[PDB]
Amino acid sequence: GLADALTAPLDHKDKGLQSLTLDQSVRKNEKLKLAAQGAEKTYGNGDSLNTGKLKNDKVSRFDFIRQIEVDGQLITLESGEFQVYKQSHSALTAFQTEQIQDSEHSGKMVAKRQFRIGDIAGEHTSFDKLPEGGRATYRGTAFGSDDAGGKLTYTIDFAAKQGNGKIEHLKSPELNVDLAAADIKPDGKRHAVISGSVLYNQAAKGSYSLGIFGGKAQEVAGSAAVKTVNGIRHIGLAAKQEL
Amino acid sequence: TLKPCDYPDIKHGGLYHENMRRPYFPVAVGKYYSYYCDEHFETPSGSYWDHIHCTQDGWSPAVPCLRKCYFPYLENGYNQNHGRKFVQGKSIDVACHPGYALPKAQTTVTCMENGWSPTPRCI
């Protein structure tokens, strides 16, 4: 239900995650206009996105237009597909660009394809409220440009406050990376966060960032950056425990 | 031994996922992070976002966010450069209509960090 997400307001009866604050998806004085199934809505840095109407453990797809006010007029910067991955206590956004503004002329749109991770939000797990011991296994999706079929496996030893994972089944082989052993550290607001190295053929290709979401640390959500023969590639990460 | 990189103070921009990245600084040489540029500012590649790299000499690019000036429409001037984009430091001449001129006998404008200097206007 893509149209309801843009038109219908916030309702507590809808499946979680109900709301998502668009911060890293929309810059301060820029506008992001989303359109799907005849519906249309504009945002808004700090504006809420009704994720509640969207289906869980799936990629929700919308058409996007990114604009900026130049001389009191909204000029298009980039356009393409806006992706939203929903889970119970977490959710994340991604952008697949199809058209961008010409380097030399504003108002002239050129065909360029860039994939980037937007926001990673939800009900953050407190570092001070994490389980004192035990091992948790997280299973979910890893998704890049033109591929949402990747399968993510992540493991957290709560006694050691350390995590390790793996990405599999992505079409691009260089993206099926290992999420190296990394320490869970407290955030500025004291949220449980994990950041470590990304490896392909036991060589460092980038970094990964994850946030622990849910009261009982039910989920993990974040992203990874991988160096490939054709450039730096971004992977959206989201996994959950057994319900 | 190589000097690690402390948190990058990206002027006129910042790092994406700041909350998750900040507790792990200083970072080793070779580490790279996706960053953004604020309104009117661009990355050396011409986008609003790119990647900053921790090298032997420090953060690369050294100037991650450069100013981008969009040439305005001149009400009483020639509009050959109307809507053209210019990187920070580049200079362009302002051709005004007969009887009109840039205030205080000026003809050339330059893209600064603040924007166009002086303001491109005819009379």
Residue numbers in the entry:
A (entry chain D): 80 to 322
B (entry chain A): 321 to 443
Sentences from the paper on this structure:
To determine whether these modifications affect the overall structure of fHbp and thence fH binding, we determined the atomic structure of fHbpDM in complex with fH67. Although substitution of Glu283 or Glu304 individually (fHbpE283A and fHbpE304A, respectively) results in a loss of detectable fH binding by far Western, neither residue alone accounts for the profound reduction in affinity observed with fHbpDM, probably because both residues form independent salt bridges with fH and are therefore both critical for binding. Characterisation of the two Glu residues in V1 fHbp that form salt bridges with fH, and their equivalent residues in V2 and V3 proteins (i.e. Thr304) indicated that these residues make independent contributions to high affinity fH binding and that different variant family proteins engage fH in distinct ways. Taken together, our results show modification of V1 fHbp at Glu283 and/or Glu304 does not affect the structure or immunogenicity of the protein, even though these residues contribute significantly to interactions with fH67. Previous work suggests that the immunogenicity of fHbpDM is impaired compared with V1 fHbp. However we found that the structure of this protein is unchanged except for the loss of the side chains of Glu283/304, and that it retained its immunogenicity in both transgenic and non-transgenic mice. Immunisation of transgenic mice with the non-functional proteins, fHbpDM, fHbpI311A, and fHbpR106A elicited similar levels of anti-V1 fHbp antibodies as determined by ELISA, demonstrating that the non-functional fHbps retain their antigenicity. The non-functional proteins also elicited SBA titres (measured using human complement), that were similar as raised against the wild-type V1 fHbp.
